[PDB]
Design an enzyme around this catalytic site. Structure first.
Site: not given
Lengths: 165, 11, 165, 11, 165, 11, 165, 11, 11, 165, 11, 165, 165, 11, 11, 165, 11, 165, 11, 165
Positions: J60, J102, J122
């Site tokens: 990832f 975030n 994303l």
């Protein structure tokens, strides 16, 4: 899926004019197609058999399906008095396109129209659900009994209708 | 106009 | 990221029918792929091993994944009772597509469907998350036990399941 | 119609 | 007109328990009232007579009106499979309020619930259409056959129903 | 929780 | 309804101080109330017992519920990792108010705060769901072990907790 | 799942 | 400031 | 413009491993680029030097930037505690992509991630602002010290960092 | 229902 | 503004029944007020003289003004085929309210209806523009010639109509 | 929470004029009150001590708080270059009201204004956060050095400032 | 940052 | 007009 | 603030008729009031002095301010060809209300109207900015030179105008 | 109608 | 549809200049097409015969159709005072495009304009409905009698107009 | 500017 | 018409440096073009002649047009204090693009900037209206008198300007 095909046998003041057949685009608007298919077989008890085309404007469309009031104020669907616009994937691309009449958003019943030209100003306010497959000449013939305001000079009739495949 | 309604036919 | 692959070994009234395997598109909807993977391994304590396809409609899809109530009213995710529509990047492009059943927006649980045609009327309202790799023939065979209303003439079972890679 | 819901199967 | 009144004669495993009667607020939600009235008298040829209350949660409400599958997945309105939330003028003010069950926006069918408390959190998401007139004590006795998860421990039925005036 | 749905009963 | 009541037995560095009890507003936010109640009884197999209040700010609030990470980053709800803002009917009216901590919209877990002042600036962004019944003097004692930044000078613990009513 | 958050890591 | 968050405490 | 280039000198449990360098897309997201650049040089008096990568997930991404709390809960931008999502022009196209961590919309701080795979899910919710120029082999070495949950088996540190160009 | 339209009269 | 006042002389089959007068709320909906004012005096060449009430429903309202087709498919305003909904300042407050019929947003023509009950569910979807002043008794006499589904048992007619002041 | 109180000691070309004190409504807008408090103590390294009122308009307000550029173009908050409109709970009710200047939505920094009349045209677009306690006479005196365009005939100074309680 | 405003120049 | 801005003072 | 007061001296085909004065609500719409105040003094070089009232409808309003084209197509403001609707705080409450004419949203120039009745259908599409203070009888007199379509029988003139306080 | 425009006066 | 075609015979002061023909795009904007078609044939009793072009701006367009006031404040459509913007399918693509003038959204009347350049900044705010077919040369001859601010140096006139096919 | 209105001609 | 061309003769502390000329895209943004053209020729009696470039950021752009306060707080359009963003058809494609400075939506005055790079992040928030035709090398030489924060180290002026054709 393999899309269904219905036929209308048209009649002019009683006289067989000919057969129009239609592909129903159950692969894009399966619920709208299914409504029209069911109304064509009569299989729910009611349907188009014996209904007229009350509004034919040459170079535009033949409107039918008001099998309750025969004037535009009527008809109902296999789902109740009205159902929702399923989607506007398909466009009014030319003659032969079969589409739903309505009285604004989410008021689909049984009334429909067969286009005798490209009707793009109607894209995205009428759910396109099928196309004339064979018999476009019969629809051409029905036009001529129309007028600019839609009154027909002779009674244009679905004498018979059902499914083929 | 050229509409296809079911009730109030408009111009 | 290499995409995971799960297997279902399907049984008809307990008679082994065959293996269906699935690529899960974790590269597009990782959360939705993982739910299904874990349900398929049973690693969280519960899952698809032993459940049935409660609604199968020839020419459309086979629906399963209801392991708590076996009728469309049940199932749960590994994230709880329900989870959100992760995204709608992928579309319903054809047979073999694995997508989520729901009861409207953000109600994903454990129920899914394996398409048997292109179902584009569903794009946007069901998160597509995988596709049949091997065994499409085994799905076309399951398809034969459904009916227009979805009730199955035999008990279509996931006698075993898990992850290949 | 042709929907794939969980609970209120609609037409 | 006045607002119409309907009655339910309630039975517990076939033993009569009592009558509950309802004011239907046809001066606020005429369409939603009428659906319930019509299904109560049976006059379209289907309705509530003989149906059960499949989910009863003491302290909260009694849910019924599922005359086609008696488990929450069923029923139908006199308008078709579903109709639109008419308005949300009335609120869930307290015990006895009668309000529509649904599966999200615009999914009113035949299921309803009878409140045994102020259920304020439902304001704006369930169309309120009536209130218990006499027989709250019978709804309170029906409660005792419910449970936290809703399962009833005896069969609670509308043995007869119809309109009083 | 305490909802009144038809099909997917939620918590 | 009768609103449930839960209790916490608060310890300071392992020493029992006393009991705080809370009314849960199940009649305004039943899903939020139910989460706190069940986390308080322990009945799902996890919950508040043994957990600490990790952030205490004098004049503002005491914050706890983080039973998995003990620092603000953790906790889970009985419904899954997070759940939605049920509603904002109840406001932060003064000391004793019980409200959900979150990480923005629709991220309710297990974390909560007990106000020690009217906190009006949180209305509409934290779901208020209960209030101190008894033991406000215990909360005030707790409040003294906090600081401007929330670090606590003693370990404030929920030694035991549960339902009274 | 696979997110990249700052504080409430989710699934 | 005075917020009650879970993870990114802000001012 | 000429896009700045920053470098990190990565240590594993205090042992220097090597250099990663990055292009910053100042020509698409200048405010986001400038934040990373300045935190990297240290020129405001705080920044990445000495900080660790607290969350590494194989397949990832590697996540760091948390120079105040070393655990995901901290960091600050050169503009204040947080700043707004500048834009979403650039997508997560593959390994090497540099993007902002975030806590939901408009909460950019100092935390960031270096992708080790295309992470398309994303797009639209993390501002992408740079890419590995050289040292991708170092990022891959780093990636091996992570795990499914992100806990790292060795302390992966930014021993030094700065601007090359 | 009880509506007052001009053309498609509804329930 | 003196608010204008009009009159209808109503005739069952051919026989005088009586006179109905209305205040037109020119101070709230001047434009709608004026359409009806002019269609009453007949002063633009067309109007309400010799039109019928084609839909009367006891306990609800009497609908008329369709001077071109006498069945609800017709009428036109002094401004043209349709005009906009002016505003909805006024509500349907009880018997005698005069309000526009329509076919959805912004299709006011000439059709109107006189209420025989508070019709609050029409609030916001029908512009209210006047109230019966004298002759409510005559309106109630008209009620009685109507049915559930609206069709009238004798031809109800505005033999004469104009403006008093 | 007791609301904090700050003081300004005002000077005209360096000639002491007098003390103005302010209640800060931290019970409504804690973040906005704290910015101003801290600027007023100078505790973060910077602040209002020594700054001037650059724009004063008789009958409207006195604007100050630009301590980096002294002309309306400058200032910074303790949270960075700018911060968001916290809420608009409080309105501009009359003389003495302390509210924030800005350059549109979410651009609060260090600039503020002390009203000298009711300024209701600003409700909703400037966060009110405080009000003059003592010294309104000292503001009415400052007011006299402004002009319709806001330029001041003398240097109005905050010779000292800080917090009383 | 790199904006082009008239009055409040931001970063 | 009567505004209280920081940068572009408007009428 | 203390609101300004302007006067118009009206003239009918040259003959002094009288003086109307107006309060301008600079306390609610300071920019709209300031435009009209400035145009009344002529102080920017142009203004109402010598302009006529081109459109007077009895029982409605007197419209003026087109000092460039004298017919409704003209006039300009002290801020440019047009400015924005400041706000709709004030309503058209009765005779004497002074409000802005426009050609839709955000097209305020110099044209205005003095109401000779309550004009509520115009609330929220025209910025109310003042009221007639003395001279309502003069405005009554101007009406009589109006008509239903607005043409005036004599030339109604602002012979002179300025400010009083 | 009764409007107060500046250009297209409407009914 | 055969797309209709109209003609204008243009006359400077009294002298014939020449003939301009247009295709009306009845297949994209049938309704707008028809208004102009009928205003050209004059067939409803009023129309374009003997009207002038009151605003001509070289390098931009020629504006006319105002048959009631000759200065842009007038005109009316065959449907009434105004009609809706039909659609904006068609763009202002270059010289010769025919498009509606208006006074903002949905106020089409009779006024139109003939472009002498691509006027792309009018796209979306003006319905485009036809293109000059023959006589573009005449249009350019008309250009020359206009000015920067639109006023024409000689009276440009449609002496005759009708329909070719 | 270059607009094509009917009544308030603008810049 | 063609698109107009304007010139700036640039001076550095009064020493002539060179000429920059611009195409103004009056075929995309006629209103925004015209403002700049008019201010360039000086024909309304104010404009750019003699004004300075107050903010120059090498690698980004040169900002000028503030002829009333020469620091970024000033200037005015030929339309009034401010005018609306006309459209955002054109993008910031690269060096030489000329575009409006502003202080948020709809605040165009007189300030503009000349890009020395592709500034894509400004697309949609600054109206692009022209591009440098000849003299980019002069804009590149002007750059060298700028700095990161924009302050210029010599006085850069538009010694003359106007229109070439």
């Amino acid at each position: 899926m393999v899309n269904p095909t219905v036929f209308f046998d048209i009649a002019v003041d009683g006289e067989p004019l000919g057969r129009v057949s239609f592909e129903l685009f159950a692969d894009k608007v399966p619920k709208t197609a299914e409504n029209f298919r069911a109304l064509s077989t009569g299989e729910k008890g009611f349907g188009y058999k014996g209904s007229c085309f009350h509004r034919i404007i040459p170079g535009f469309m033949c409107q039918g399906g008001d099998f309750t009031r025969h004037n535009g104020t009527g008809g109902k669907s296999i789902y109740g008095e009205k159902f929702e616009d399923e989607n506007f994937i398909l466009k009014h691309t030319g003659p032969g396109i079969l589409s739903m009449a309505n009285a604004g958003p989410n008021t689909n019943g049984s009334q429909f129209f067969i286009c005798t030209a490209k009707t793009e100003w109607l894209d995205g306010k009428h759910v396109v659900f099928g196309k004339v497959k064979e018999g476009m000449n019969i629809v051409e013939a029905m036009e001529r009994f129309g007028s600019r305001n839609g009154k027909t000079s002779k009674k244009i009739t679905i004498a018979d209708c059902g499914q083929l495949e | 106009x050229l509409l296809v309604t079911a009730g109030l036919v408009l111009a």
